[PDB]
Ligand binder design. Sequence first.
Ligand SMILES: NC(=O)C1=CN([C@@H]2O[C@H](COP(=O)(O)OP(=O)(O)OC[C@H]3O[C@@H](n4cnc5c(N)ncnc54)[C@H](OP(=O)(O)O)[C@@H]3O)[C@@H](O)[C@H]2O)C=CC1
Ligand SMILES: Nc1nc(N)c2nc(CNc3ccc(C(=O)N[C@@H](CCCNC(=O)c4ccccc4C(=O)O)C(=O)O)cc3)cnc2n1
Length: 186
Amino acid sequence: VGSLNCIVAVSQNMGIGKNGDLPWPPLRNEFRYFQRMTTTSSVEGKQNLVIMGKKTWFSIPEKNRPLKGRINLVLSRELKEPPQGAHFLSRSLDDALKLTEQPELANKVDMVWIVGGSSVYKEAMNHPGHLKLFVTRIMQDFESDTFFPEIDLEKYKLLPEYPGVLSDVQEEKGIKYKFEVYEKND
Ligand SMILES: NC(=O)C1=CN([C@@H]2O[C@H](COP(=O)(O)OP(=O)(O)OC[C@H]3O[C@@H](n4cnc5c(N)ncnc54)[C@H](OP(=O)(O)O)[C@@H]3O)[C@@H](O)[C@H]2O)C=CC1
Ligand SMILES: Nc1nc(N)c2nc(CNc3ccc(C(=O)N[C@@H](CCCNC(=O)c4ccccc4C(=O)O)C(=O)O)cc3)cnc2n1
């Protein structure tokens, strides 16, 4: 279909979260991009699937829930039913994908995106396969409580250029960030 894409925004300090929210002021072009990648499908007829954790689902305003133009999928080991507005519940990343394969998720599912969080990016990586890491490098410190799982990066390729990805350092709201994409076929 599509390959395990991971999409994360990192602060220099390796922070991704802080009290169920973002280590930084919301940055709208970074949001538009995020929207861009995860929704956008070439196969016709098919949606992308975004796999996300309990605390990530919840950070996202009710208002944009479930994310417009993507099958929303939630990972929790505690709810019984999936959070409202949210399309599936899956106790673990191995079954999230089994489901894809399952009967109706089959013809529909085009790519699958890992929006996070921590143990989800944690399950991801540690998979043998075609994984591309879409990394947004917020080039500032923000005190955060939740962090990026570190990637043995001698095992990834840093593509200099990616299809539709800005390659020069971007500056919104006095903040400065840059996009890099990583690969691995292990
Ligand atoms: N800035 C960015 O790019 C990103 C920021 N964020 C932010 O970072 C923080 C997210 O907090 P974090 O603790 O990472 O929480 P997550 O939202 O990733 O947690 C999802 C919940 O789901 C469960 N879960 C997670 N991984 C798995 C798994 N592999 N199998 C089953 N259940 C799983 C855990 O809950 P249970 O007890 O249900 O198992 C966890 O509580 C918030 O600040 C959020 O806004 C998140 C993603 C990207
Ligand atoms: N790289 C990258 N990777 C990630 N995994 C990632 N994860 C998060 C996780 N926490 C959230 C919180 C909110 C939303 C959300 O709300 N989602 C909308 C975006 C619409 C844009 N909304 C705006 O910011 C906005 C608001 C008003 C006017 C203009 C805009 C705009 O985007 O220009 C959508 O459809 O995807 C998503 C994730 C945050 N940042 C990330 N960055």
